[PDB]
CSV table of C-alpha atoms in Angstrom, one decimal:
chain,number,residue,atom,x,y,z
A,1231,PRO,CA,0.0,0.0,0.0
A,1232,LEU,CA,1.5,3.3,-1.2
A,1233,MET,CA,-0.1,6.3,0.5
A,1234,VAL,CA,0.9,10.0,0.1
A,1235,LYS,CA,-0.5,13.0,1.9
A,1236,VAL,CA,0.5,16.6,1.1
A,1237,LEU,CA,-1.1,19.5,2.9
A,1238,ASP,CA,-3.7,17.5,4.6
A,1239,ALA,CA,-5.3,20.4,6.6
A,1240,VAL,CA,-4.8,24.1,5.7
A,1241,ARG,CA,-6.2,27.2,7.2
A,1242,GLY,CA,-5.3,30.9,7.3
A,1243,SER,CA,-4.5,32.0,3.7
A,1244,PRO,CA,-1.1,30.6,2.7
A,1245,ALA,CA,0.6,31.2,-0.7
A,1246,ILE,CA,2.0,28.0,-2.0
A,1247,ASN,CA,3.6,26.4,-5.1
A,1248,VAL,CA,3.0,22.6,-5.1
A,1249,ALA,CA,4.5,19.9,-7.3
A,1250,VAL,CA,3.8,16.2,-6.4
A,1251,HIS,CA,5.0,13.3,-8.5
A,1252,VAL,CA,4.3,9.6,-7.7
A,1253,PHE,CA,5.6,6.8,-9.8
A,1254,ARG,CA,5.3,3.0,-9.7
A,1255,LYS,CA,6.6,0.4,-12.1
A,1256,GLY,CA,20.4,9.1,-34.7
A,1257,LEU,CA,21.7,12.1,-32.7
A,1258,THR,CA,19.5,12.5,-29.6
A,1259,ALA,CA,17.1,10.0,-28.0
A,1260,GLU,CA,15.2,10.3,-24.7
A,1261,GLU,CA,12.9,8.0,-22.8
A,1262,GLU,CA,10.0,8.5,-20.3
A,1263,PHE,CA,11.3,11.6,-18.5
A,1264,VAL,CA,9.8,14.6,-16.8
A,1265,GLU,CA,11.3,18.0,-17.6
A,1266,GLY,CA,10.8,21.6,-16.7
A,1267,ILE,CA,8.0,21.5,-14.2
A,1268,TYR,CA,8.8,25.0,-12.9
A,1269,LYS,CA,11.3,26.5,-15.4
A,1270,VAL,CA,12.1,30.2,-16.2
A,1271,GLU,CA,14.3,31.0,-19.2
A,1272,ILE,CA,15.3,34.6,-19.8
A,1273,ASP,CA,17.6,35.9,-22.6
A,1274,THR,CA,18.4,32.3,-23.7
A,1275,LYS,CA,20.4,32.1,-27.0
A,1276,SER,CA,21.2,29.1,-29.1
A,1277,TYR,CA,23.0,29.4,-32.4
A,1278,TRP,CA,23.8,26.0,-34.0
A,1279,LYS,CA,22.2,22.8,-32.8
A,1280,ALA,CA,21.8,19.3,-34.5
A,1281,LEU,CA,22.6,20.6,-38.0
A,1282,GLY,CA,22.2,17.0,-39.4
A,1283,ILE,CA,24.1,14.0,-40.6
A,1284,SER,CA,27.2,14.8,-42.6
A,1285,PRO,CA,27.0,18.6,-43.0
A,1286,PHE,CA,29.8,20.5,-44.6
A,1287,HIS,CA,31.2,17.2,-45.7
A,1288,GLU,CA,33.8,18.4,-48.3
A,1289,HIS,CA,35.5,21.7,-49.2
A,1290,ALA,CA,33.4,23.9,-46.9
A,1291,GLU,CA,34.4,27.5,-46.2
A,1292,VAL,CA,32.5,28.9,-43.2
A,1293,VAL,CA,32.8,32.3,-41.6
A,1294,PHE,CA,30.9,32.4,-38.3
A,1295,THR,CA,30.4,35.7,-36.4
A,1296,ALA,CA,28.1,36.2,-33.4
A,1297,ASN,CA,27.6,39.7,-32.1
A,1298,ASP,CA,25.4,40.1,-29.0
A,1299,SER,CA,25.8,43.7,-28.1
A,1300,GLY,CA,22.8,45.9,-27.3
A,1301,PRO,CA,21.2,48.1,-24.7
A,1302,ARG,CA,18.8,45.7,-22.9
A,1303,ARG,CA,17.3,46.0,-19.4
A,1304,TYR,CA,15.5,43.4,-17.4
A,1305,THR,CA,13.7,44.3,-14.1
A,1306,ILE,CA,11.9,41.5,-12.2
A,1307,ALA,CA,10.5,41.4,-8.6
A,1308,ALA,CA,9.4,38.2,-6.9
A,1309,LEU,CA,10.6,35.6,-9.4
A,1310,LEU,CA,9.2,32.2,-8.4
A,1311,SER,CA,8.8,33.6,-4.8
A,1312,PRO,CA,5.3,33.4,-3.4
A,1313,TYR,CA,4.5,36.1,-0.7
A,1314,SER,CA,1.8,36.8,1.8
A,1315,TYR,CA,0.9,39.9,3.8
A,1316,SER,CA,3.8,41.7,2.2
A,1317,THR,CA,4.5,44.6,-0.2
A,1318,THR,CA,6.2,44.4,-3.6
A,1319,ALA,CA,7.0,47.5,-5.7
A,1320,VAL,CA,9.1,48.4,-8.7
A,1321,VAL,CA,9.7,52.1,-9.2
A,1322,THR,CA,11.6,53.7,-12.0
B,713,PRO,CA,-3.7,0.2,-3.3
B,714,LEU,CA,-2.3,3.5,-4.5
B,715,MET,CA,-3.9,6.5,-2.8
B,716,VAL,CA,-2.9,10.2,-3.1
B,717,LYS,CA,-4.4,13.1,-1.2
B,718,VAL,CA,-3.4,16.7,-1.9
B,719,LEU,CA,-5.0,19.7,-0.1
B,720,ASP,CA,-7.7,17.5,1.6
B,721,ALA,CA,-9.3,20.4,3.6
B,722,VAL,CA,-8.8,24.1,2.8
B,723,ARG,CA,-10.3,27.2,4.4
B,724,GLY,CA,-9.4,30.9,4.5
B,725,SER,CA,-8.6,32.1,0.9
B,726,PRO,CA,-5.2,30.7,-0.1
B,727,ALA,CA,-3.5,31.4,-3.5
B,728,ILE,CA,-2.1,28.2,-4.9
B,729,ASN,CA,-0.5,26.7,-7.9
B,730,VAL,CA,-1.0,22.9,-8.0
B,731,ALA,CA,0.5,20.2,-10.2
B,732,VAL,CA,-0.1,16.6,-9.4
B,733,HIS,CA,1.1,13.7,-11.6
B,734,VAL,CA,0.4,10.0,-10.8
B,735,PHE,CA,1.8,7.2,-13.0
B,736,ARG,CA,1.6,3.4,-13.0
B,737,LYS,CA,2.9,0.8,-15.4
B,738,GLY,CA,16.7,10.2,-37.8
B,739,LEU,CA,17.9,13.1,-35.8
B,740,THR,CA,15.6,13.4,-32.7
B,741,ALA,CA,13.3,10.9,-31.1
B,742,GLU,CA,11.4,11.2,-27.8
B,743,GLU,CA,9.1,8.8,-26.0
B,744,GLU,CA,6.2,9.1,-23.4
B,745,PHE,CA,7.5,12.2,-21.6
B,746,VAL,CA,6.0,15.2,-19.8
B,747,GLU,CA,7.4,18.6,-20.6
B,748,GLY,CA,6.9,22.2,-19.6
B,749,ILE,CA,4.0,22.0,-17.1
B,750,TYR,CA,4.8,25.5,-15.8
B,751,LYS,CA,7.3,27.1,-18.2
B,752,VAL,CA,8.0,30.8,-18.9
B,753,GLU,CA,10.2,31.7,-21.9
B,754,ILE,CA,11.2,35.3,-22.4
B,755,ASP,CA,13.4,36.7,-25.2
B,756,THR,CA,14.4,33.2,-26.4
B,757,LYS,CA,16.3,33.0,-29.7
B,758,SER,CA,17.2,30.0,-31.9
B,759,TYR,CA,19.0,30.4,-35.2
B,760,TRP,CA,19.8,27.1,-36.8
B,761,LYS,CA,18.2,23.8,-35.7
B,762,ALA,CA,17.9,20.4,-37.4
B,763,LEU,CA,18.7,21.7,-40.9
B,764,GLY,CA,18.4,18.2,-42.3
B,765,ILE,CA,20.2,15.2,-43.7
B,766,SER,CA,23.4,16.1,-45.6
B,767,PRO,CA,23.1,19.9,-46.0
B,768,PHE,CA,25.9,21.9,-47.5
B,769,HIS,CA,27.4,18.6,-48.7
B,770,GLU,CA,29.9,19.9,-51.2
B,771,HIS,CA,31.6,23.2,-52.0
B,772,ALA,CA,29.5,25.3,-49.7
B,773,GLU,CA,30.4,28.9,-48.9
B,774,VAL,CA,28.5,30.3,-46.0
B,775,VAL,CA,28.8,33.7,-44.2
B,776,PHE,CA,26.8,33.6,-41.0
B,777,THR,CA,26.3,36.9,-39.0
B,778,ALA,CA,24.0,37.3,-36.0
B,779,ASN,CA,23.4,40.8,-34.6
B,780,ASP,CA,21.2,41.1,-31.5
B,781,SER,CA,21.6,44.7,-30.5
B,782,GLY,CA,18.6,46.9,-29.8
B,783,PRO,CA,16.9,49.0,-27.1
B,784,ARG,CA,14.6,46.5,-25.3
B,785,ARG,CA,13.1,46.7,-21.9
B,786,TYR,CA,11.2,44.0,-19.9
B,787,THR,CA,9.5,44.8,-16.6
B,788,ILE,CA,7.7,42.1,-14.7
B,789,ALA,CA,6.3,41.8,-11.2
B,790,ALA,CA,5.3,38.6,-9.5
B,791,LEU,CA,6.5,36.1,-12.1
B,792,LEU,CA,5.1,32.6,-11.1
B,793,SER,CA,4.7,33.9,-7.5
B,794,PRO,CA,1.1,33.7,-6.1
B,795,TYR,CA,0.4,36.3,-3.4
B,796,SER,CA,-2.4,37.0,-0.9
B,797,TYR,CA,-3.4,40.0,1.2
B,798,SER,CA,-0.5,41.9,-0.3
B,799,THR,CA,0.2,44.8,-2.7
B,800,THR,CA,1.9,44.7,-6.1
B,801,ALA,CA,2.7,47.8,-8.2
B,802,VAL,CA,4.8,48.8,-11.2
B,803,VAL,CA,5.3,52.5,-11.5
B,804,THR,CA,7.3,54.2,-14.4
C,957,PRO,CA,-7.4,0.4,-6.7
C,958,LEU,CA,-6.0,3.8,-7.8
C,959,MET,CA,-7.7,6.7,-6.0
C,960,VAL,CA,-6.7,10.4,-6.2
C,961,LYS,CA,-8.2,13.2,-4.3
C,962,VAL,CA,-7.3,16.9,-4.9
C,963,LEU,CA,-8.9,19.8,-3.1
C,964,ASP,CA,-11.6,17.6,-1.4
C,965,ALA,CA,-13.2,20.4,0.6
C,966,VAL,CA,-12.8,24.1,-0.1
C,967,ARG,CA,-14.3,27.2,1.5
C,968,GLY,CA,-13.5,30.9,1.7
C,969,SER,CA,-12.7,32.1,-1.8
C,970,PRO,CA,-9.3,30.9,-2.9
C,971,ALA,CA,-7.6,31.6,-6.2
C,972,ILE,CA,-6.1,28.4,-7.7
C,973,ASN,CA,-4.5,27.0,-10.8
C,974,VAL,CA,-4.9,23.2,-10.9
C,975,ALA,CA,-3.4,20.6,-13.2
C,976,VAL,CA,-4.0,16.9,-12.5
C,977,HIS,CA,-2.7,14.1,-14.6
C,978,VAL,CA,-3.3,10.4,-14.0
C,979,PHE,CA,-1.9,7.6,-16.2
C,980,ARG,CA,-2.1,3.8,-16.2
C,981,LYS,CA,-0.8,1.3,-18.8
C,982,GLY,CA,12.9,11.3,-41.0
C,983,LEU,CA,14.1,14.2,-38.8
C,984,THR,CA,11.8,14.4,-35.8
C,985,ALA,CA,9.5,11.8,-34.2
C,986,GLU,CA,7.6,12.0,-30.9
C,987,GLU,CA,5.3,9.5,-29.1
C,988,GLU,CA,2.5,9.8,-26.6
C,989,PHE,CA,3.7,12.9,-24.7
C,990,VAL,CA,2.1,15.8,-22.9
C,991,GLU,CA,3.6,19.3,-23.6
C,992,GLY,CA,3.0,22.9,-22.5
C,993,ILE,CA,0.1,22.5,-20.0
C,994,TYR,CA,0.8,26.1,-18.7
C,995,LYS,CA,3.3,27.7,-21.1
C,996,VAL,CA,4.0,31.4,-21.7
C,997,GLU,CA,6.2,32.4,-24.6
C,998,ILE,CA,7.1,36.1,-25.1
C,999,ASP,CA,9.3,37.5,-27.9
C,1000,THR,CA,10.3,34.0,-29.1
C,1001,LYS,CA,12.3,33.9,-32.4
C,1002,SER,CA,13.2,31.0,-34.6
C,1003,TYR,CA,15.0,31.5,-37.9
C,1004,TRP,CA,15.8,28.2,-39.6
C,1005,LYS,CA,14.3,24.9,-38.6
C,1006,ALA,CA,14.0,21.5,-40.4
C,1007,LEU,CA,14.8,22.9,-43.8
C,1008,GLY,CA,14.5,19.4,-45.3
C,1009,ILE,CA,16.4,16.4,-46.7
C,1010,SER,CA,19.6,17.4,-48.6
C,1011,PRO,CA,19.2,21.2,-48.9
C,1012,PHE,CA,22.0,23.3,-50.4
C,1013,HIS,CA,23.5,20.0,-51.6
C,1014,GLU,CA,26.1,21.4,-54.1
C,1015,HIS,CA,27.7,24.7,-54.9
C,1016,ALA,CA,25.6,26.8,-52.5
C,1017,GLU,CA,26.5,30.4,-51.7
C,1018,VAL,CA,24.5,31.7,-48.7
C,1019,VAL,CA,24.7,35.0,-46.9
C,1020,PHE,CA,22.8,34.9,-43.6
C,1021,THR,CA,22.2,38.1,-41.6
C,1022,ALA,CA,19.9,38.4,-38.6
C,1023,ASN,CA,19.3,41.9,-37.2
C,1024,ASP,CA,17.1,42.1,-34.1
C,1025,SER,CA,17.4,45.7,-33.0
C,1026,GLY,CA,14.4,47.8,-32.2
C,1027,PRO,CA,12.7,49.9,-29.5
C,1028,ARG,CA,10.4,47.3,-27.8
C,1029,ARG,CA,8.9,47.5,-24.3
C,1030,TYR,CA,7.0,44.7,-22.4
C,1031,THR,CA,5.3,45.4,-19.1
C,1032,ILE,CA,3.5,42.6,-17.3
C,1033,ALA,CA,2.1,42.3,-13.8
C,1034,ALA,CA,1.1,39.0,-12.1
C,1035,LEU,CA,2.4,36.5,-14.7
C,1036,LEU,CA,1.1,33.1,-13.8
C,1037,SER,CA,0.6,34.3,-10.2
C,1038,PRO,CA,-2.9,34.0,-8.8
C,1039,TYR,CA,-3.7,36.5,-6.1
C,1040,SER,CA,-6.5,37.1,-3.5
C,1041,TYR,CA,-7.5,40.1,-1.4
C,1042,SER,CA,-4.7,42.1,-2.9
C,1043,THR,CA,-4.0,45.0,-5.2
C,1044,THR,CA,-2.3,45.0,-8.6
C,1045,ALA,CA,-1.6,48.2,-10.6
C,1046,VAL,CA,0.5,49.2,-13.6
C,1047,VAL,CA,1.0,53.0,-13.9
C,1048,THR,CA,3.0,54.7,-16.7
D,823,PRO,CA,-11.1,0.6,-10.0
D,824,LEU,CA,-9.8,4.0,-11.0
D,825,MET,CA,-11.5,6.9,-9.2
D,826,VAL,CA,-10.5,10.6,-9.4
D,827,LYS,CA,-12.1,13.4,-7.4
D,828,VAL,CA,-11.2,17.1,-8.0
D,829,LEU,CA,-12.9,19.9,-6.0
D,830,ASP,CA,-15.5,17.7,-4.4
D,831,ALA,CA,-17.2,20.4,-2.4
D,832,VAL,CA,-16.7,24.2,-3.0
D,833,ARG,CA,-18.3,27.2,-1.3
D,834,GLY,CA,-17.6,30.9,-1.1
D,835,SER,CA,-16.8,32.2,-4.6
D,836,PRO,CA,-13.3,31.0,-5.7
D,837,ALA,CA,-11.6,31.9,-9.0
D,838,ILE,CA,-10.1,28.7,-10.5
D,839,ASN,CA,-8.5,27.3,-13.6
D,840,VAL,CA,-8.9,23.6,-13.8
D,841,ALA,CA,-7.3,21.0,-16.2
D,842,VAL,CA,-7.9,17.3,-15.5
D,843,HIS,CA,-6.6,14.5,-17.7
D,844,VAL,CA,-7.2,10.8,-17.1
D,845,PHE,CA,-5.7,8.1,-19.4
D,846,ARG,CA,-5.9,4.3,-19.5
D,847,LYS,CA,-4.5,1.9,-22.1
D,848,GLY,CA,9.1,12.4,-44.1
D,849,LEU,CA,10.3,15.2,-41.8
D,850,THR,CA,8.0,15.4,-38.8
D,851,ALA,CA,5.7,12.7,-37.3
D,852,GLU,CA,3.8,12.8,-34.0
D,853,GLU,CA,1.5,10.3,-32.2
D,854,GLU,CA,-1.3,10.5,-29.7
D,855,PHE,CA,-0.1,13.6,-27.8
D,856,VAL,CA,-1.7,16.5,-25.9
D,857,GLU,CA,-0.3,19.9,-26.5
D,858,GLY,CA,-1.0,23.5,-25.4
D,859,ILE,CA,-3.8,23.1,-22.9
D,860,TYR,CA,-3.1,26.6,-21.5
D,861,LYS,CA,-0.7,28.4,-23.9
D,862,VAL,CA,-0.1,32.1,-24.4
D,863,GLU,CA,2.1,33.1,-27.4
D,864,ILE,CA,3.0,36.8,-27.8
D,865,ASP,CA,5.3,38.3,-30.5
D,866,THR,CA,6.3,34.8,-31.8
D,867,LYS,CA,8.2,34.9,-35.1
D,868,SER,CA,9.2,32.0,-37.3
D,869,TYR,CA,11.0,32.5,-40.7
D,870,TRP,CA,11.9,29.3,-42.4
D,871,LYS,CA,10.4,25.9,-41.4
D,872,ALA,CA,10.1,22.6,-43.3
D,873,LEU,CA,10.8,24.0,-46.7
D,874,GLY,CA,10.7,20.6,-48.2
D,875,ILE,CA,12.6,17.6,-49.7
D,876,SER,CA,15.7,18.7,-51.6
D,877,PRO,CA,15.3,22.5,-51.8
D,878,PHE,CA,18.1,24.6,-53.3
D,879,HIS,CA,19.7,21.4,-54.5
D,880,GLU,CA,22.2,22.8,-57.0
D,881,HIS,CA,23.8,26.2,-57.7
D,882,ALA,CA,21.6,28.2,-55.3
D,883,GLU,CA,22.5,31.8,-54.4
D,884,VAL,CA,20.5,33.0,-51.4
D,885,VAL,CA,20.7,36.3,-49.5
D,886,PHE,CA,18.7,36.1,-46.3
D,887,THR,CA,18.1,39.3,-44.2
D,888,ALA,CA,15.8,39.5,-41.2
D,889,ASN,CA,15.2,43.0,-39.7
D,890,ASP,CA,13.0,43.1,-36.6
D,891,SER,CA,13.2,46.7,-35.5
D,892,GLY,CA,10.1,48.7,-34.7
D,893,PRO,CA,8.5,50.7,-31.9
D,894,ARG,CA,6.2,48.2,-30.2
D,895,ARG,CA,4.6,48.2,-26.8
D,896,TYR,CA,2.9,45.4,-24.9
D,897,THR,CA,1.1,46.0,-21.6
D,898,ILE,CA,-0.7,43.2,-19.8
D,899,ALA,CA,-2.1,42.8,-16.3
D,900,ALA,CA,-3.0,39.4,-14.7
D,901,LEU,CA,-1.8,37.0,-17.4
D,902,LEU,CA,-3.0,33.5,-16.5
D,903,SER,CA,-3.5,34.7,-12.9
D,904,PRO,CA,-7.0,34.4,-11.5
D,905,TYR,CA,-7.9,36.8,-8.7
D,906,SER,CA,-10.6,37.3,-6.2
D,907,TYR,CA,-11.7,40.2,-4.0
D,908,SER,CA,-8.8,42.3,-5.5
D,909,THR,CA,-8.3,45.3,-7.7
D,910,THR,CA,-6.5,45.3,-11.1
D,911,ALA,CA,-5.8,48.5,-13.1
D,912,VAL,CA,-3.7,49.7,-16.0
D,913,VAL,CA,-3.3,53.4,-16.2
D,914,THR,CA,-1.4,55.3,-19.0
E,1408,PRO,CA,-14.8,0.8,-13.4
E,1409,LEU,CA,-13.5,4.3,-14.3
E,1410,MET,CA,-15.2,7.1,-12.4
E,1411,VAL,CA,-14.4,10.8,-12.5
E,1412,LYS,CA,-15.9,13.6,-10.5
E,1413,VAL,CA,-15.1,17.3,-11.0
E,1414,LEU,CA,-16.8,20.1,-9.0
E,1415,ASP,CA,-19.4,17.8,-7.5
E,1416,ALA,CA,-21.1,20.4,-5.3
E,1417,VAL,CA,-20.7,24.2,-5.9
E,1418,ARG,CA,-22.3,27.1,-4.2
E,1419,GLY,CA,-21.7,30.9,-3.9
E,1420,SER,CA,-20.9,32.2,-7.4
E,1421,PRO,CA,-17.4,31.1,-8.5
E,1422,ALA,CA,-15.7,32.0,-11.7
E,1423,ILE,CA,-14.2,28.9,-13.3
E,1424,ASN,CA,-12.5,27.7,-16.5
E,1425,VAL,CA,-12.9,23.9,-16.7
E,1426,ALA,CA,-11.2,21.4,-19.1
E,1427,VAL,CA,-11.8,17.7,-18.5
E,1428,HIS,CA,-10.4,15.0,-20.8
E,1429,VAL,CA,-11.0,11.2,-20.3
E,1430,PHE,CA,-9.5,8.6,-22.6
E,1431,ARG,CA,-9.6,4.8,-22.8
E,1432,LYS,CA,-8.2,2.4,-25.4
E,1433,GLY,CA,5.3,13.5,-47.1
E,1434,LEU,CA,6.5,16.3,-44.9
E,1435,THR,CA,4.2,16.4,-41.8
E,1436,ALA,CA,1.9,13.7,-40.4
E,1437,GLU,CA,0.0,13.7,-37.1
E,1438,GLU,CA,-2.3,11.1,-35.4
E,1439,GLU,CA,-5.1,11.2,-32.9
E,1440,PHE,CA,-3.9,14.3,-30.9
E,1441,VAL,CA,-5.6,17.1,-28.9
E,1442,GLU,CA,-4.3,20.6,-29.5
E,1443,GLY,CA,-4.9,24.1,-28.3
E,1444,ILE,CA,-7.8,23.7,-25.8
E,1445,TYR,CA,-7.1,27.1,-24.4
E,1446,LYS,CA,-4.7,29.0,-26.7
E,1447,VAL,CA,-4.1,32.7,-27.2
E,1448,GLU,CA,-2.0,33.8,-30.1
E,1449,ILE,CA,-1.1,37.5,-30.4
E,1450,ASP,CA,1.1,39.1,-33.1
E,1451,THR,CA,2.2,35.7,-34.5
E,1452,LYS,CA,4.1,35.8,-37.7
E,1453,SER,CA,5.1,33.0,-40.1
E,1454,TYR,CA,6.9,33.6,-43.4
E,1455,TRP,CA,7.8,30.4,-45.2
E,1456,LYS,CA,6.4,27.0,-44.3
E,1457,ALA,CA,6.2,23.7,-46.2
E,1458,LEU,CA,6.9,25.2,-49.6
E,1459,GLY,CA,6.8,21.8,-51.2
E,1460,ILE,CA,8.7,18.9,-52.7
E,1461,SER,CA,11.9,20.1,-54.5
E,1462,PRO,CA,11.4,23.8,-54.7
E,1463,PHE,CA,14.2,26.0,-56.1
E,1464,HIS,CA,15.8,22.9,-57.4
E,1465,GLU,CA,18.3,24.4,-59.9
E,1466,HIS,CA,19.8,27.8,-60.5
E,1467,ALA,CA,17.6,29.7,-58.1
E,1468,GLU,CA,18.5,33.3,-57.1
E,1469,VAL,CA,16.4,34.4,-54.1
E,1470,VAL,CA,16.6,37.7,-52.2
E,1471,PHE,CA,14.6,37.4,-48.9
E,1472,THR,CA,14.0,40.5,-46.8
E,1473,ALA,CA,11.7,40.7,-43.7
E,1474,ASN,CA,11.0,44.1,-42.2
E,1475,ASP,CA,8.8,44.1,-39.1
E,1476,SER,CA,9.0,47.7,-37.9
E,1477,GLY,CA,5.9,49.7,-37.1
E,1478,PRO,CA,4.2,51.6,-34.2
E,1479,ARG,CA,1.9,49.0,-32.7
E,1480,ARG,CA,0.4,48.9,-29.2
E,1481,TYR,CA,-1.4,46.1,-27.4
E,1482,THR,CA,-3.2,46.6,-24.1
E,1483,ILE,CA,-4.9,43.7,-22.4
E,1484,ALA,CA,-6.3,43.2,-18.8
E,1485,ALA,CA,-7.2,39.8,-17.3
E,1486,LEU,CA,-5.9,37.5,-20.0
E,1487,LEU,CA,-7.1,34.0,-19.3
E,1488,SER,CA,-7.6,35.0,-15.6
E,1489,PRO,CA,-11.1,34.7,-14.2
E,1490,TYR,CA,-12.0,37.0,-11.4
E,1491,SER,CA,-14.8,37.5,-8.8
E,1492,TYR,CA,-15.9,40.3,-6.6
E,1493,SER,CA,-13.1,42.4,-8.0
E,1494,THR,CA,-12.5,45.5,-10.2
E,1495,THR,CA,-10.8,45.6,-13.6
E,1496,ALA,CA,-10.1,48.9,-15.5
E,1497,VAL,CA,-8.0,50.1,-18.4
E,1498,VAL,CA,-7.6,53.9,-18.6
E,1499,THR,CA,-5.7,55.8,-21.3
């Protein structure tokens, strides 16, 4: 007998993030996984990935240049952070 | 007997994010997975992915230039953060 | 006997996001998955993907230029964050 | 016997988002999946995808230029965030 | 015996979004899927997709230019966020 109890009795206004998982039992291959339940990606860059089988096989001339240079601003308050009876403010 | 209880009794106005999962039992291949239940992607860039089988096989001349340079502004409050009896404000 | 209970008894005005999943048992191939139950994509860019079998096979001359440079502004409050008895405001 | 109960008894005006799933048992191929139950896509750009079998096979001259540079403004309050007994305002 | 109960007893004016799914058992091919139950697409752009079998096979000269640069403004309140006993306002 497998028995799981999470947050059986709750009272008084909480702020919660819950994730419960119960289990009982070519270039890239993956099998029966769980990925990115709570994931935050910001300013993620990928350039070349899995081009293919035998690319640029013979006599290839490649010039690769990656320029990542710009005025960018990211302002975040309370990222993945639950709060209660509090105050959050962003002033510019 | 498999028995799961989540948040059996609740009272008093909570703010919740719930995710419950129960289980019982070529270039890219994937099998019977679970992905991105709570996912936030911001400013995500991908340039070249899985072009194909045998690209640019012979005598290929490629000039690759990636410029990512611009005035961009992102302002976020309470990202994936539930709140209760609180105050959230963004002032510019 | 498989038995799942989520939020059996609730009272007092909560704000909830619920996701319950129960289970019992060429370039890209995928099988019997679950994807993007709660997904937020903002400013997502993809340029070249899965062009095909044998592209640019012989004597290909390619000039690739990617310019991503512009005045853009994103303002968001309470992204994927349920709230109760609170205050949310965006002032510009 | 498979038995699932979600939100058995509810009282007092909640604000909820519910998603319940129960299960019992060439370039791109997909099989018996579930995708994008709650998905929000904003400013999503795709340029080249699945052009076909053997494109630009011989003696192809391609000039590719992507300019994404313009004054754009996105203002959102309470994205995928249910609220109750609260206040939401966007003032410009 | 498969038995599913969602929101058995409800009282007191809630605001809900419900999605219940129960199951028991060439370039692109798809099979017996479920897609986009609650999907919001804003400012989505696609340029070239599935052109066909063997396009631009021989001696093709292509100039591709994509300009996305204009004054555009999007203002949204309560996107996919049910509310109750609250106040929502957009003032410009």
